[PDB]
Amino acid sequence: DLRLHLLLNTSVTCNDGSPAGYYLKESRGSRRWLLFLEGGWYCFNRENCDSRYDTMRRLMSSRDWPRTRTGTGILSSQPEENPYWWNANMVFIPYCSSDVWSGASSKSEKNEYAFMGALIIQEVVRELLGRGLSGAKVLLLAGSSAGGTGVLLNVDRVAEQLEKLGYPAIQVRGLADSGWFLDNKQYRAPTEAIRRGIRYWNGVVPERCRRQFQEGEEWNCFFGYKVYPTLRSPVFVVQWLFDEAQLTVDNVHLTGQPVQEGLRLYIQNLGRELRHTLKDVPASFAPACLSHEIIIRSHWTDVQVKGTSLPRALHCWDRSLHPLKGCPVHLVDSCPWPHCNPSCPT
Ligand SMILES: Nc1ccc(NCc2cccnc2)c(C(=O)O)c1
Ligand SMILES: *[C@@H]1O[C@H](CO)[C@@H](O)[C@H](O)[C@H]1NC(C)=O
């Protein structure tokens, strides 16, 4: 169990003005820290944010959060469940800003909701430095789905924050799970929703990427293959080749089981395009499966690419940041259809 702490600075809030927070389990014999960003879409105007507040309120408010959470997957402290980082200090940061962790805007007489995702991450880091993070050697910023995209948007800002605070010895790294999307043509859109969202949230993107695409085009930096080459911190990319949320935004629904030629070609092309975008990503894990998220699911140890599991690949990554014989870090499936890899989740 990780224990809830609400932020001491109560001006850093969830959507409805309630304090943001984090869940923490310390490991006093370790100098490694894992900060995980929760996912789950986003909302981009008053009407669809109001709907989210009715039936997804834990993603907009801390009023009903429980006092504890069990750590699972990469957040588990049992070596049987987490071969990679079982002895690390564990942090779970709930997603209550609905802004893909990009926002920097308070609730006011002009704003019904606060969108403070980018500021929530910075305040969590600040308050953790007083609880042992000041002694860390590695800070791994991880996340799934919208939290995976949030890693890409925030990892270099965390590194700059710690540099300016006088901690040049902490190595900041990123782990982005299921947050590497394509702005592709639909089978029958995220780019327009994100564009409107950034204006509604006062959203912020990494500075080098912002300077490339410039004013009005910041939405480009929410797409992994465009923002990743601008980042300085090491980032490991975990991405199913046939991600269920990618297929949803593409208006694809695999149902009833009889795929005709047009849909077959569409799905095969999506796999090939996302393989292409990862070809020059040296730390990556991309299996040919139809699924969504992996790193905090308990059976995350089961899937393999070319005979190597994800916990093994992450360990090999750690070794590379001290090629390695028999301990690979770039693992991308080549077969072209979902579940052509036998280790895919059932
Ligand atoms: N259905 C669905 C679709 C997208 C998701 N990610 C947000 C996102 C979308 C596009 C670009 N970047 C981030 C999620 C989730 O967070 O679980 C669920
Ligand atoms: C609280 O957070 C806000 C928003 O980031 C910041 O402007 C303010 O300085 C913080 N207060 C303290 C005491 O750090």
Side-chain angles (χ1 to χ4, degrees), residues 181-194 196-198 200-214 216-231 233-238 240-259 261-324 326-328:
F181 293 89
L182 303 180
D183 52 344
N184 60 345
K185 172 173 205 137
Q186 306 186 108
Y187 174 64
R188 295 193 171 92
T191 54
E192 189 52 39
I194 295 287
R196 287 161 181 196
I198 292 167
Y200 191 52
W201 308 326
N202 193 35
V204 307
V205 302
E207 184 178 67
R208 186 169 290 110
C209 188
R210 185 196 73 66
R211 284 169 173 171
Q212 287 181 358
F213 289 101
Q214 294 185 334
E217 295 281 320
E218 299 87 355
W219 66 266
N220 283 283
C221 302
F222 284 60
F223 288 83
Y225 76 97
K226 300 186 206 187
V227 60
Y228 168 94
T230 76
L231 302 177
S233 306
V235 174
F236 184 78
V237 174
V238 178
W240 305 116
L241 295 180
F242 311 103
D243 188 274
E244 285 161 346
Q246 177 78 53
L247 288 175
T248 290
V249 297
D250 285 330
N251 294 139
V252 169
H253 314 283
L254 294 175
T255 315
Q257 292 179 356
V259 178
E261 184 200 26
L263 187 48
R264 176 178 58 253
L265 289 168
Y266 186 90
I267 290 170
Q268 283 176 335
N269 185 57
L270 167 66
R272 277 185 326 251
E273 288 183 352
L274 189 152
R275 299 206 311 273
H276 182 260
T277 65
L278 295 173
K279 176 161 218 289
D280 296 328
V281 176
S284 51
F285 189 90
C289 314
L290 172 66
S291 197
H292 188 238
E293 303 183 336
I294 182 181
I295 62 171
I296 59 162
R297 318 193 298 190
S298 296
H299 297 262
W300 70 279
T301 51
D302 290 333
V303 64
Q304 296 180 9
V305 172
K306 292 172 171 64
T308 298
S309 72
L310 175 56
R312 181 157 177 76
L314 294 166
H315 157 71
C316 297
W317 186 44
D318 286 7
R319 285 186 58 198
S320 81
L321 294 173
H322 299 168
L324 313 157
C327 186

Side-chain angles (χ1 to χ4, degrees), residues 103-107 111 113-116 119 200-202:
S105 167
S106 297
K107 177 159 163 53
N111 303 325
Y113 299 105
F115 295 100
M116 303 185 74
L119 300 178
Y200 191 52
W201 308 326
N202 193 35

Side-chain angles (χ1 to χ4, degrees), residues 11 18 22 27 32 34 45 64 85 145 162 172 227 311:
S11 295
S18 58
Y22 60 95
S27 178
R32 284 161 307 121
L34 183 63
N45 63 37
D64 302 325
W85 266 27
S145 302
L162 290 172
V172 179
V227 60

Side-chain angles (χ1 to χ4, degrees), residues 36-62 64-66 68-109 111-136 138-140 142-154 156-159 161-162 165-194 196-198 200-214 216-231 233-238 240-242:
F36 172 86
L37 302 179
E38 186 184 25
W41 272 346
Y42 62 76
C43 65
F44 59 91
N45 63 37
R46 174 68 179 275
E47 299 85 16
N48 60 46
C49 288
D50 283 347
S51 184
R52 191 180 172 85
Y53 198 77
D54 285 320
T55 59
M56 296 189 276
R57 189 173 288 179
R58 284 170 295 169
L59 300 178
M60 305 195 60
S61 186
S62 61
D64 302 325
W65 291 352
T68 63
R69 277 192 64 93
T70 314
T72 58
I74 199 170
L75 291 174
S76 176
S77 299
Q78 303 180 117
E80 297 84 9
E81 181 161 341
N82 180 8
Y84 174 54
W85 266 27
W86 61 269
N87 204 33
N89 297 273
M90 299 309 186
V91 178
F92 180 105
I93 306 179
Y95 180 43
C96 67
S97 49
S98 308
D99 55 3
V100 180
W101 298 94
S102 75
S105 167
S106 297
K107 177 159 163 53
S108 78
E109 81 166 8
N111 303 325
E112 175 66 352
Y113 299 105
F115 295 100
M116 303 185 74
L119 300 178
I120 290 170
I121 291 170
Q122 303 273 96
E123 184 68 34
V124 171
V125 169
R126 193 177 317 161
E127 300 183 13
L128 287 175
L129 289 163
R131 287 176 172 272
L133 180 62
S134 55
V138 180
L139 192 172
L140 183 56
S144 301
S145 302
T149 306
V151 172
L152 297 178
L153 295 171
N154 286 282
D156 282 1
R157 190 167 300 114
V158 172
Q161 183 193 1
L162 290 172
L165 288 163
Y167 293 104
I170 300 170
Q171 297 177 63
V172 179
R173 311 173 176 168
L175 172 52
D177 169 28
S178 290
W180 187 273
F181 293 89
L182 303 180
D183 52 344
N184 60 345
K185 172 173 205 137
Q186 306 186 108
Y187 174 64
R188 295 193 171 92
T191 54
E192 189 52 39
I194 295 287
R196 287 161 181 196
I198 292 167
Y200 191 52
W201 308 326
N202 193 35
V204 307
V205 302
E207 184 178 67
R208 186 169 290 110
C209 188
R210 185 196 73 66
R211 284 169 173 171
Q212 287 181 358
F213 289 101
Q214 294 185 334
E217 295 281 320
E218 299 87 355
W219 66 266
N220 283 283
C221 302
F222 284 60
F223 288 83
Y225 76 97
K226 300 186 206 187
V227 60
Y228 168 94
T230 76
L231 302 177
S233 306
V235 174
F236 184 78
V237 174
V238 178
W240 305 116
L241 295 180
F242 311 103

